[PDB]
Amino acid sequence: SMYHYIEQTWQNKDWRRSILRKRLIEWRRQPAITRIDRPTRLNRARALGYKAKQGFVMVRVRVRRGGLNKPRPNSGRRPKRMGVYGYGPSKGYRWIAEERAARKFPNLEVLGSYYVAEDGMYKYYEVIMVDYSHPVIRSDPELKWLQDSVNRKRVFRGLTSAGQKSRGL
Template sequence: KYVSELWRKKQSDALRFLFRVRAWEYRQGNRIVRLNHPSRPDKARTLGYKAKEGYVVYRVAVRRGNRKRPVARGIVHGKPKGQGVNQLKFARNLRSVAEE
């Protein structure tokens, strides 16, 4: 109960410090990391997590923002409609990309 109260006030000094430290740690590590326990136990419990065998938790870093078309030096061919490189929206959501 106390932990969930903390998470409601995201601008508090404690959480801002926690976010800053965790963001730095996450940047130093690998993109896919298996965790021993969830970083938010209260939220994980509400989503159905139980602390017993058979439940695994991973943290996956996913590229933020739009999808970039993989073309060499930005050279595209075809009609003007298909000329876009940068502002393409990915069809799948970030969760499905992370689970891939």
Template sequence: VNLEVNDPQRKEESVKDEFGSPFGGVAVFQGAYKYVFELWRKKQSDLMRFLQRVRCSEYRQHPSIRPIRPDKARRLGYKAKQGYVIYRVRVRRGGCKRPVPKGIVYGKPKNQGITQLKFQRNKSLIVSAKQDSTYKYFKIILMDAAHNAIGNDPRINWICNPVHKHRELRGLTSAGKKYRGLRGSGHLNTKARPSRRATWKRNNTVSLRRCH
């Protein structure tokens, strides 16, 4: 960022954003996370393409200790304190294959497929990206509900309640709600609530009320 402080009245106009700021060339004072965000918007730049290649090599070798994108991690709730941990998980790209012994299947021909099966849930929910030729890599923010730092924090200790056990298995996380179709609201989104199966069952069940 270049600042010309000779003329105080035009100080703000002289700031030039080198990262392609969305403010139309007019420079404003921004925080550090804003510049990190602008860097990640241009993933096809030479700098980011080189970093992605280097990091994909590191992902195969090293564990995940801290977030690569601290700005996005903090937007999603991460805090650099005890009780929070970052995990990096990989999921094989492409369709899934049915684990049947020796390829022996039973039932109707319609249900006998083994390869080219498409998983119904999105991959971010399966592991909840980076990717190489074989895997997709995701980072997961986890919290230790038994840690005192989490239990004593009034902003996050709701997760210690037993009713929130295994939220990821019941589609209650952000990625889970996305694949369930619960991001939208209004017209036609009522078909996704409380779930697609519950809506289908409600619309295809004949309810005969008993008259007294």
């Protein structure tokens, strides 16, 4: 399939990593949460459940890498509980990126994510989101589970793929 060859050009250590560097220069200027027209990696999107119907949207999110933005305590602590450096959010940056996308698009449900790039200050992810109220999605037989109100806003309760991994499941 052509999807097998998409993953080969974007694989590991390649001349393609000269093309991808040029994109990053543009991506650093666009807003931190943007809707994009088409997935950058169709192999990753189609495996996670993206289709070419209307109601599927693609969002790119950039976050800031590093550890937790943790302040030094100001009241009295034992020496164990006074340390700052080395802490990272037990939630992954992949799960943090999905959460910020679900804030800006409150009518869509997160289906998956994968990252696309990385530089010295940010990490970039792309999130697959679907509109559960469009009549095209409402009639789909493979997403009939998405008509249950318990299956909405799952990203906030750790029920996505990135959340299951981080819960030790």
